[PDB]
Amino acid sequence: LEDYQKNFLELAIECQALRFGSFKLKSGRESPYFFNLGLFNTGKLLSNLATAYAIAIIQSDLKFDVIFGPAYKGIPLAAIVCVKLAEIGGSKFQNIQYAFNRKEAGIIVGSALENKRILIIDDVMTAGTAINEAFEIISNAKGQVVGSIIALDRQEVVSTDDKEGLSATQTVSKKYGIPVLSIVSLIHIITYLEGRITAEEKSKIEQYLQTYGAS
Amino acid sequence: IMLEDYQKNFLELAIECQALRFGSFKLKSGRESPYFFNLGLFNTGKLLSNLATAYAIAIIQSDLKFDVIFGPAYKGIPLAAIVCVKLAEIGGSKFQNIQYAFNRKEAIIVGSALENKRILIIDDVMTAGTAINEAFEIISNAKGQVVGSIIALDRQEVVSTDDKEGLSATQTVSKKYGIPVLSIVSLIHIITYLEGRITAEEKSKIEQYLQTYGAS
Ligand SMILES: O=C(O)c1cc(=O)[nH]c(=O)n1[C@@H]1O[C@H](COP(=O)(O)O)[C@@H](O)[C@H]1O
Ligand SMILES: O=C(O)c1cc(=O)[nH]c(=O)n1[C@@H]1O[C@H](COP(=O)(O)O)[C@@H](O)[C@H]1O
Ligand SMILES: [Cl-]
Ligand SMILES: [Cl-]
């Protein structure tokens, strides 16, 4: 793990973004843990979060024109990361733009996406549903998606039906031929924060991963 | 009038990025304006960084004590976020734990509960004050306590031409709620700073507009 990933994880517990318990996910799956990025809610935490995203993006060498955040929670993410890229990235990141959608229209707020290289930013990927929806919106605007970044790759399958059992992030990359970046993955949480996870929570996570974990 | 270096720099960028334009614009209040300020055109990382800093300096200057910065959906949302971040970055210990919040158009608050929290409303521009009033009601529904407002531009216009006192939208809001209304710049700043860069024709159009709508 890199230092910024360690700090991200440390702050994730501090602000309670990483919670263990019983959670019904968007996809319907009953999960033993939940990552709530919305809990990085202070000026200090948002600054650190924007920095983590920016570092991951810069180190990827991805070339793009526009960072797009899906409504609603992706909107602040796109804005703060756009800023942070200009602050820590140097000359080629000064003119990167940000955009987002309205839920109902004139759907896109920002410069026209047509023929621009777009990086999608979001919080967490589980089954990949949220990113597919963002893809649809971008394609309607005639944007060219060149990559995606999330804070947490939960490293789960799109569906248990799929025999290959590729993760949601793996399936997006393969389908589109685009990088899918993550600040951290579930494996990083398990290994680094092993002490702060109890024996029961450890087993609950492993049992969950037996059903939903990528191969 | 006084112009801070950061205000001059902000205006320079506003011209550069097309945020500030002169010409015929029908405002959302129906008023036919000789100029328009489109803050959404501060749309790059560099422009947003300067914008966040400008808002932050004005907020710091004011000594306003608050818990939450609230930006109305949709265009208020990035403003709340970037300013919450900037304040923690350049404002010191006092701003480390301030939070941001915003509304959904329909289910409604995104963020920690607003109840019993001191709220700073952030928005782009005030003309007749209609948008800020709508934000007041949202925060009211949520039982938050509004302690201040900040906008990028105070257009210095009346709420209604029928009011004989002729208080501006920002003056009206301030008197009604007993709270400060801050702005990065006002129309007077734009006119004073740009001098002859606004053409004679453009100047007279502004003067004619303010003869109809300008605050006393
Ligand atoms: O429901 C989830 O899958 C989920 C798990 C989690 O740990 N954190 C989390 O925020 N979520 C929510 O579910 C989304 C990810 O699920 P997918 O759209 O299936 O990838 C995120 O965008 C969140 O809205
Ligand atoms: O329509 C306007 O009055 C207006 C003028 C301007 O220069 N810039 C600008 O953005 N506007 C839009 O009008 C709103 C302000 O109008 P009021 O709600 O009357 O105060 C802003 O929130 C913008 O949506
Ligand atoms: Cl959302
Ligand atoms: Cl809007």
From Swiss-Prot, chain A:
Residue list for modification Phosphoserine: 203, 215
A GO CC annotation given for this chain? cytoplasm
Matching Pfam families, A to Z?
A: Pribosyltran
| Listed pathway(s) | Pyrimidine metabolism; UMP biosynthesis via de novo pathway; UMP from orotate: step 1/2
Q: Where does 5-phospho-alpha-D-ribose 1-diphosphate bind?
A: 26, 72-73, 102-103, 122-130
Q: Which residues bind orotate?
A: 34-35, 126, 154
Output one GO BP term: pyrimidine ribonucleoside biosynthetic process
Q: What class of enzyme is it?
A: transferase
The molecular function terms in GO held by this entry are: orotate phosphoribosyltransferase activity
- Cross-referenced CDD domains: PRTases_typeI
List the catalytic activities from the record.
orotidine 5'-phosphate + diphosphate = orotate + 5-phospho-alpha-D-ribose 1-diphosphate
List its EC numbers: 2.4.2.10
The source's superkingdom equals: Eukaryota
Which SUPFAM superfamilies does the UniProt record give?
A: PRTase-like (SSF53271)
Q: Which UniProt keywords apply?
A: Glycosyltransferase, Phosphoprotein, Pyrimidine biosynthesis, Transferase
Other remarks in the entry:
There are two genes coding for OPRT in yeast. Present with 39300 molecules/cell in log phase SD medium.
**Record's function text:** Catalyzes the transfer of a ribosyl phosphate group from 5-phosphoribose 1-diphosphate to orotate, leading to the formation of orotidine monophosphate (OMP).
Q: Which HAMAP family match?
A: PyrE (MF_01208)
Protein family membership? Belongs to the purine/pyrimidine phosphoribosyltransferase family. PyrE subfamily.
Q: Which PANTHER family match?
A: OROTATE PHOSPHORIBOSYLTRANSFERASE 1-RELATED
Could you describe the subunit structure of this protein? Homodimer.
* Name under which the protein is recorded: Orotate phosphoribosyltransferase 1
Q: Which species is the source of this protein? A: Saccharomyces cerevisiae (strain ATCC 204508 / S288c) (Baker's yeast)
Lineage of origin = Eukaryota, Fungi, Dikarya, Ascomycota, Saccharomycotina
Gene name of the record: URA5
From Swiss-Prot, chain B:
The GO cellular component terms are: cytoplasm; nucleus
**Which residues does orotate bind?**
36-37, 127, 155
Tell me the route in metabolism or biology where this protein functions: Pyrimidine metabolism; UMP biosynthesis via de novo pathway; UMP from orotate: step 1/2
| CDD domains tied to this protein | PRTases_typeI
Supply the SUPFAM superfamilies for this chain: PRTase-like
According to the UniProt entry, which residues carry Phosphoserine?
Answer: 204, 216
- Quickly give the catalysed reaction: orotidine 5'-phosphate + diphosphate = orotate + 5-phospho-alpha-D-ribose 1-diphosphate
Tell me which PANTHER family the record gives: OROTATE PHOSPHORIBOSYLTRANSFERASE 1-RELATED
HAMAP family annotated for this entry? PyrE
Tell me the protein's name. Answer: Orotate phosphoribosyltransferase 1
Name the source organism.
Answer: Saccharomyces cerevisiae (strain ATCC 204508 / S288c) (Baker's yeast)
